[PDB]
mmCIF file of all heavy atoms in Angstrom:
data_model
loop_
_atom_site.group_PDB
_atom_site.id
_atom_site.type_symbol
_atom_site.label_atom_id
_atom_site.label_comp_id
_atom_site.label_asym_id
_atom_site.label_seq_id
_atom_site.Cartn_x
_atom_site.Cartn_y
_atom_site.Cartn_z
ATOM 1 N N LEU A 1 28.260 -11.608 -36.118
ATOM 2 C CA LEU A 1 28.926 -12.847 -36.510
ATOM 3 C C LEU A 1 28.716 -13.960 -35.498
ATOM 4 O O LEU A 1 29.184 -15.083 -35.724
ATOM 5 C CB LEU A 1 30.430 -12.656 -36.741
ATOM 6 C CG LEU A 1 30.751 -11.584 -37.775
ATOM 7 C CD1 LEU A 1 32.220 -11.245 -37.733
ATOM 8 C CD2 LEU A 1 30.349 -12.069 -39.151
ATOM 9 N N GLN A 2 28.034 -13.689 -34.392
ATOM 10 C CA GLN A 2 27.726 -14.696 -33.392
ATOM 11 C C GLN A 2 26.277 -14.646 -32.936
ATOM 12 O O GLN A 2 25.839 -15.566 -32.236
ATOM 13 C CB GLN A 2 28.654 -14.543 -32.177
ATOM 14 C CG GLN A 2 30.105 -14.935 -32.448
ATOM 15 C CD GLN A 2 30.914 -13.822 -33.094
ATOM 16 O OE1 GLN A 2 31.648 -14.053 -34.055
ATOM 17 N NE2 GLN A 2 30.782 -12.609 -32.570
ATOM 18 N N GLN A 3 25.528 -13.611 -33.308
ATOM 19 C CA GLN A 3 24.096 -13.530 -33.032
ATOM 20 C C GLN A 3 23.502 -12.516 -33.994
ATOM 21 O O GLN A 3 23.857 -11.335 -33.938
ATOM 22 C CB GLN A 3 23.832 -13.122 -31.586
ATOM 23 C CG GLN A 3 22.449 -13.497 -31.085
ATOM 24 C CD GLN A 3 21.349 -12.628 -31.661
ATOM 25 O OE1 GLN A 3 21.420 -11.400 -31.609
ATOM 26 N NE2 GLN A 3 20.329 -13.264 -32.225
ATOM 27 N N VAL A 4 22.604 -12.962 -34.861
ATOM 28 C CA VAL A 4 22.053 -12.084 -35.884
ATOM 29 C C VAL A 4 20.927 -11.249 -35.295
ATOM 30 O O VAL A 4 20.136 -11.723 -34.470
ATOM 31 C CB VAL A 4 21.565 -12.892 -37.099
ATOM 32 C CG1 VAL A 4 20.406 -13.795 -36.718
ATOM 33 C CG2 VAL A 4 21.167 -11.958 -38.237
ATOM 34 N N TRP A 5 20.876 -9.984 -35.698
ATOM 35 C CA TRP A 5 19.686 -9.161 -35.515
ATOM 36 C C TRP A 5 18.829 -9.339 -36.757
ATOM 37 O O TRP A 5 19.064 -8.694 -37.781
ATOM 38 C CB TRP A 5 20.048 -7.696 -35.310
ATOM 39 C CG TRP A 5 20.582 -7.375 -33.965
ATOM 40 C CD1 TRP A 5 19.903 -6.817 -32.922
ATOM 41 C CD2 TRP A 5 21.921 -7.580 -33.509
ATOM 42 N NE1 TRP A 5 20.738 -6.666 -31.843
ATOM 43 C CE2 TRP A 5 21.984 -7.127 -32.179
ATOM 44 C CE3 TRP A 5 23.074 -8.109 -34.097
ATOM 45 C CZ2 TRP A 5 23.153 -7.182 -31.429
ATOM 46 C CZ3 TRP A 5 24.233 -8.161 -33.353
ATOM 47 C CH2 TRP A 5 24.264 -7.702 -32.033
ATOM 48 N N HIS A 6 17.821 -10.206 -36.674
ATOM 49 C CA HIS A 6 16.856 -10.287 -37.761
ATOM 50 C C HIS A 6 15.947 -9.072 -37.671
ATOM 51 O O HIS A 6 14.728 -9.196 -37.515
ATOM 52 C CB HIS A 6 16.054 -11.588 -37.703
ATOM 53 C CG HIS A 6 16.815 -12.791 -38.164
ATOM 54 N ND1 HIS A 6 17.404 -12.866 -39.408
ATOM 55 C CD2 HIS A 6 17.070 -13.973 -37.556
ATOM 56 C CE1 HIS A 6 17.999 -14.037 -39.542
ATOM 57 N NE2 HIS A 6 17.809 -14.730 -38.433
ATOM 58 N N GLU A 7 16.550 -7.891 -37.764
ATOM 59 C CA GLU A 7 15.882 -6.620 -37.513
ATOM 60 C C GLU A 7 15.334 -6.021 -38.803
ATOM 61 O O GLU A 7 15.586 -4.870 -39.151
ATOM 62 C CB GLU A 7 16.855 -5.672 -36.823
ATOM 63 C CG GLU A 7 16.219 -4.544 -36.053
ATOM 64 C CD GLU A 7 17.073 -4.105 -34.881
ATOM 65 O OE1 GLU A 7 16.900 -4.661 -33.777
ATOM 66 O OE2 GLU A 7 17.927 -3.215 -35.066
ATOM 67 N N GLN A 8 14.580 -6.840 -39.532
ATOM 68 C CA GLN A 8 13.786 -6.392 -40.664
ATOM 69 C C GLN A 8 12.359 -6.066 -40.251
ATOM 70 O O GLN A 8 11.458 -6.061 -41.098
ATOM 71 C CB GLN A 8 13.790 -7.456 -41.762
ATOM 72 C CG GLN A 8 15.177 -7.938 -42.145
ATOM 73 C CD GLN A 8 15.947 -6.909 -42.940
ATOM 74 O OE1 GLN A 8 16.827 -6.230 -42.411
ATOM 75 N NE2 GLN A 8 15.617 -6.784 -44.220
ATOM 76 N N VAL A 9 12.145 -5.798 -38.961
ATOM 77 C CA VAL A 9 10.802 -5.656 -38.422
ATOM 78 C C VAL A 9 10.080 -4.485 -39.073
ATOM 79 O O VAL A 9 10.692 -3.493 -39.486
ATOM 80 C CB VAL A 9 10.859 -5.479 -36.897
ATOM 81 C CG1 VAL A 9 11.239 -6.787 -36.232
ATOM 82 C CG2 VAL A 9 11.859 -4.390 -36.541
ATOM 83 N N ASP A 10 8.760 -4.598 -39.142
ATOM 84 C CA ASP A 10 7.935 -3.591 -39.790
ATOM 85 C C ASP A 10 7.845 -2.355 -38.897
ATOM 86 O O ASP A 10 8.492 -2.250 -37.852
ATOM 87 C CB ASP A 10 6.561 -4.163 -40.116
ATOM 88 C CG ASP A 10 5.742 -4.451 -38.876
ATOM 89 O OD1 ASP A 10 6.339 -4.665 -37.800
ATOM 90 O OD2 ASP A 10 4.497 -4.462 -38.975
ATOM 91 N N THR A 11 7.020 -1.397 -39.316
ATOM 92 C CA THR A 11 6.920 -0.124 -38.617
ATOM 93 C C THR A 11 6.267 -0.250 -37.246
ATOM 94 O O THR A 11 6.324 0.705 -36.465
ATOM 95 C CB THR A 11 6.148 0.873 -39.481
ATOM 96 O OG1 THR A 11 6.390 2.204 -39.014
ATOM 97 C CG2 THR A 11 4.658 0.585 -39.422
ATOM 98 N N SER A 12 5.652 -1.394 -36.934
ATOM 99 C CA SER A 12 5.048 -1.579 -35.618
ATOM 100 C C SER A 12 6.110 -1.612 -34.526
ATOM 101 O O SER A 12 5.967 -0.961 -33.485
ATOM 102 C CB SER A 12 4.216 -2.860 -35.595
ATOM 103 O OG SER A 12 4.991 -3.972 -36.003
ATOM 104 N N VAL A 13 7.186 -2.372 -34.745
ATOM 105 C CA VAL A 13 8.294 -2.375 -33.794
ATOM 106 C C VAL A 13 8.949 -1.005 -33.745
ATOM 107 O O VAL A 13 9.429 -0.571 -32.691
ATOM 108 C CB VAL A 13 9.305 -3.480 -34.157
ATOM 109 C CG1 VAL A 13 10.564 -3.355 -33.316
ATOM 110 C CG2 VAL A 13 8.676 -4.849 -33.971
ATOM 111 N N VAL A 14 8.976 -0.299 -34.876
ATOM 112 C CA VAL A 14 9.528 1.051 -34.902
ATOM 113 C C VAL A 14 8.731 1.963 -33.975
ATOM 114 O O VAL A 14 9.298 2.723 -33.180
ATOM 115 C CB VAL A 14 9.545 1.584 -36.346
ATOM 116 C CG1 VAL A 14 10.265 2.903 -36.414
ATOM 117 C CG2 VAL A 14 10.187 0.574 -37.276
ATOM 118 N N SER A 15 7.400 1.881 -34.050
ATOM 119 C CA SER A 15 6.551 2.650 -33.144
ATOM 120 C C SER A 15 6.741 2.211 -31.700
ATOM 121 O O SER A 15 6.737 3.040 -30.784
ATOM 122 C CB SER A 15 5.085 2.508 -33.547
ATOM 123 O OG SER A 15 4.637 1.176 -33.372
ATOM 124 N N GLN A 16 6.879 0.903 -31.474
ATOM 125 C CA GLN A 16 7.083 0.404 -30.118
ATOM 126 C C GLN A 16 8.352 0.984 -29.512
ATOM 127 O O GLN A 16 8.364 1.400 -28.348
ATOM 128 C CB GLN A 16 7.136 -1.124 -30.127
ATOM 129 C CG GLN A 16 7.624 -1.753 -28.831
ATOM 130 C CD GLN A 16 6.940 -1.177 -27.605
ATOM 131 O OE1 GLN A 16 5.713 -1.106 -27.540
ATOM 132 N NE2 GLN A 16 7.734 -0.762 -26.626
ATOM 133 N N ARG A 17 9.429 1.033 -30.293
ATOM 134 C CA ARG A 17 10.676 1.606 -29.806
ATOM 135 C C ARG A 17 10.563 3.116 -29.643
ATOM 136 O O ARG A 17 11.155 3.693 -28.725
ATOM 137 C CB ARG A 17 11.814 1.245 -30.752
ATOM 138 C CG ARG A 17 11.988 -0.248 -30.951
ATOM 139 C CD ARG A 17 13.036 -0.524 -32.003
ATOM 140 N NE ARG A 17 12.700 0.114 -33.268
ATOM 141 C CZ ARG A 17 13.276 1.219 -33.719
ATOM 142 N NH1 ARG A 17 14.201 1.847 -33.013
ATOM 143 N NH2 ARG A 17 12.904 1.713 -34.895
ATOM 144 N N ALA A 18 9.812 3.774 -30.527
ATOM 145 C CA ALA A 18 9.618 5.213 -30.398
ATOM 146 C C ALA A 18 8.883 5.559 -29.110
ATOM 147 O O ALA A 18 9.248 6.513 -28.412
ATOM 148 C CB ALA A 18 8.859 5.747 -31.611
ATOM 149 N N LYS A 19 7.847 4.790 -28.775
ATOM 150 C CA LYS A 19 7.040 5.082 -27.594
ATOM 151 C C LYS A 19 7.696 4.600 -26.307
ATOM 152 O O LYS A 19 7.556 5.251 -25.266
ATOM 153 C CB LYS A 19 5.648 4.462 -27.733
ATOM 154 C CG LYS A 19 4.642 5.320 -28.498
ATOM 155 C CD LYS A 19 4.963 5.387 -29.979
ATOM 156 C CE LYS A 19 3.747 5.752 -30.806
ATOM 157 N NZ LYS A 19 4.125 6.032 -32.220
ATOM 158 N N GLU A 20 8.411 3.475 -26.351
ATOM 159 C CA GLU A 20 9.117 2.996 -25.171
ATOM 160 C C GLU A 20 10.264 3.911 -24.778
ATOM 161 O O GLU A 20 10.786 3.781 -23.666
ATOM 162 C CB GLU A 20 9.662 1.587 -25.409
ATOM 163 C CG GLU A 20 10.941 1.559 -26.233
ATOM 164 C CD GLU A 20 11.270 0.180 -26.772
ATOM 165 O OE1 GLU A 20 10.484 -0.759 -26.530
ATOM 166 O OE2 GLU A 20 12.316 0.037 -27.441
ATOM 167 N N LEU A 21 10.665 4.828 -25.659
ATOM 168 C CA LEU A 21 11.802 5.692 -25.398
ATOM 169 C C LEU A 21 11.409 7.152 -25.235
ATOM 170 O O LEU A 21 12.176 7.918 -24.643
ATOM 171 C CB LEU A 21 12.823 5.569 -26.535
ATOM 172 C CG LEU A 21 13.471 4.192 -26.709
ATOM 173 C CD1 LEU A 21 14.387 4.141 -27.937
ATOM 174 C CD2 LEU A 21 14.160 3.707 -25.463
ATOM 175 N N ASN A 22 10.243 7.549 -25.741
ATOM 176 C CA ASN A 22 9.666 8.867 -25.495
ATOM 177 C C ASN A 22 8.625 8.718 -24.393
ATOM 178 O O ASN A 22 7.549 8.156 -24.619
ATOM 179 C CB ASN A 22 9.043 9.442 -26.764
ATOM 180 C CG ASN A 22 10.060 10.098 -27.666
ATOM 181 O OD1 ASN A 22 10.968 10.779 -27.196
ATOM 182 N ND2 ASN A 22 9.917 9.896 -28.970
ATOM 183 N N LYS A 23 8.946 9.218 -23.202
ATOM 184 C CA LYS A 23 8.106 9.000 -22.033
ATOM 185 C C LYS A 23 7.025 10.058 -21.849
ATOM 186 O O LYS A 23 6.132 9.865 -21.017
ATOM 187 C CB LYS A 23 8.974 8.928 -20.772
ATOM 188 C CG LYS A 23 9.504 7.534 -20.466
ATOM 189 C CD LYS A 23 10.618 7.131 -21.420
ATOM 190 C CE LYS A 23 11.781 8.103 -21.354
ATOM 191 N NZ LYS A 23 12.985 7.566 -22.046
ATOM 192 N N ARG A 24 7.079 11.165 -22.589
ATOM 193 C CA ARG A 24 6.001 12.145 -22.554
ATOM 194 C C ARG A 24 5.679 12.737 -23.918
ATOM 195 O O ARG A 24 4.830 13.632 -23.996
ATOM 196 C CB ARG A 24 6.333 13.276 -21.571
ATOM 197 C CG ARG A 24 7.364 14.252 -22.080
ATOM 198 C CD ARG A 24 7.983 14.988 -20.920
ATOM 199 N NE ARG A 24 8.342 14.070 -19.843
ATOM 200 C CZ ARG A 24 9.330 13.186 -19.899
ATOM 201 N NH1 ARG A 24 10.107 13.082 -20.965
ATOM 202 N NH2 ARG A 24 9.552 12.395 -18.854
ATOM 203 N N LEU A 25 6.325 12.277 -24.986
ATOM 204 C CA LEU A 25 5.953 12.659 -26.341
ATOM 205 C C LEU A 25 5.905 11.401 -27.195
ATOM 206 O O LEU A 25 6.005 10.288 -26.669
ATOM 207 C CB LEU A 25 6.940 13.675 -26.917
ATOM 208 C CG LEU A 25 6.442 14.649 -27.986
ATOM 209 C CD1 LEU A 25 5.417 15.608 -27.403
ATOM 210 C CD2 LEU A 25 7.609 15.411 -28.590
#
């Protein structure tokens, strides 16, 4: 209600978050 997450991002950001959080897998 004070800052929107325009988080409709495609699967590329999904992969980016997957890899930025899995440090050896």
Side-chain angles (χ1 to χ4, degrees):
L1 304 168
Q2 290 83 226
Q3 201 287 308
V4 65
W5 284 260
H6 284 304
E7 202 151 270
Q8 309 287 103
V9 288
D10 68 335
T11 198
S12 54
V13 171
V14 187
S15 66
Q16 168 48 51
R17 303 174 303 104
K19 275 71 158 171
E20 79 195 2
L21 296 175
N22 278 320
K23 273 74 59 167
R24 75 201 46 70
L25 207 66

